[PDB]
Ligand binder design. Structure first.
Ligand SMILES: NC(=O)c1ccc[n+]([C@@H]2O[C@H](COP(=O)([O-])OP(=O)(O)OC[C@H]3O[C@@H](n4cnc5c(N)ncnc54)[C@H](OP(=O)(O)O)[C@@H]3O)[C@@H](O)[C@H]2O)c1
Ligand SMILES: Nc1nc(=O)c2nc(CNc3ccc(C(=O)N[C@@H](CCC(=O)O)C(=O)O)cc3)cnc2[nH]1
Ligand SMILES: [Mn+2]
Ligand SMILES: [Mn+2]
Ligand SMILES: [Mn+2]
Ligand SMILES: [Mn+2]
Length: 159
């Protein structure tokens, strides 16, 4: 089972200049909680944007070029990435935009954080078909002293 996890600002913006244009520790905590002890698949630009391995998860990096760090696993196609996860119950695809596009059609779940932030972007989440998806969990949070925007955790499951 393949899932996507992402945080989306207004207009589905997910990134700008190889970074996320917000800082929401509560959302990072949600990401960790939903990815720990699962394999994570990411594209090379996201690997560079994170800048180090995510602990406690098998990190699988897509790139057409040879890998440059044996602390993570490098693969050259979607099907190789899936295979490298092995027999696990849930594979987490953690972006970025190009990777989400390719995995969305295989995905059965989406973990989306909807952030109430206006931010210029150069990367978006796919313009997915809402009719394909059932919202099964929603949890809204107002901004607080640690988290400058309001945000909503949503889980959707393919109908
Ligand atoms: N808000 C969020 O939830 C979130 C999540 C993740 C990332 N981001 C942001 O998204 C941006 C990065 O996204 P992006 O779309 O630019 O890049 P990306 O999807 O992270 O990486 C794309 C690269 O992955 C490799 N790749 C992808 N598909 C491949 C395939 N089928 N076979 C082989 N290699 C493949 C290629 O590397 P090569 O060029 O080496 O071949 C490609 O250039 C950053 O701004 C980042 O901060 C945001
Ligand atoms: N909901 C969501 N939010 C994001 O920020 C996010 N980010 C990525 C890719 N980028 C990143 C960047 C940093 C960290 C990171 O440092 N995570 C730590 C957080 C520890 C904590 O704050 O509790 C981790 O161990 O997961 C993860 C993913 C992919 N999907 C996402 N999905
Ligand atoms: Mn805001
Ligand atoms: Mn429509
Ligand atoms: Mn919804
Ligand atoms: Mn709700």
């Amino acid at each position: 089972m393949i899932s996507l996890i992402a945080a989306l600002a207004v207009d589905r913006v997910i990134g700008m200049e190889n970074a996320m244009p917000w800082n929401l520790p509560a959302d990072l905590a949600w990401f960790k909680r939903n990815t720990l002890n699962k394999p994570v698949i990411m594209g090379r630009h996201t690997w560079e944007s994170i800048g180090r391995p995510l602990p406690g998860r098998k990190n699988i990096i897509l790139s057409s070029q040879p890998g440059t760090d044996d602390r993570v696993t490098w693969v050259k196609s979607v099907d190789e990435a899936i295979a490298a996860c092995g027999d696990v119950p849930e594979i987490m695809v953690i972006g970025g935009g190009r990777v989400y596009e390719q995995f969305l059609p295989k995905a059965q779940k989406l973990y989306l954080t909807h952030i109430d932030a206006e931010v210029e972007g150069d990367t978006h989440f796919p313009d997915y078909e809402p009719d394909d998806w059932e919202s099964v969990f929603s949890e809204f949070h107002d901004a607080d002293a640690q988290n400058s925007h309001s945000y909503c955790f949503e889980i959707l499951e393919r109908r």
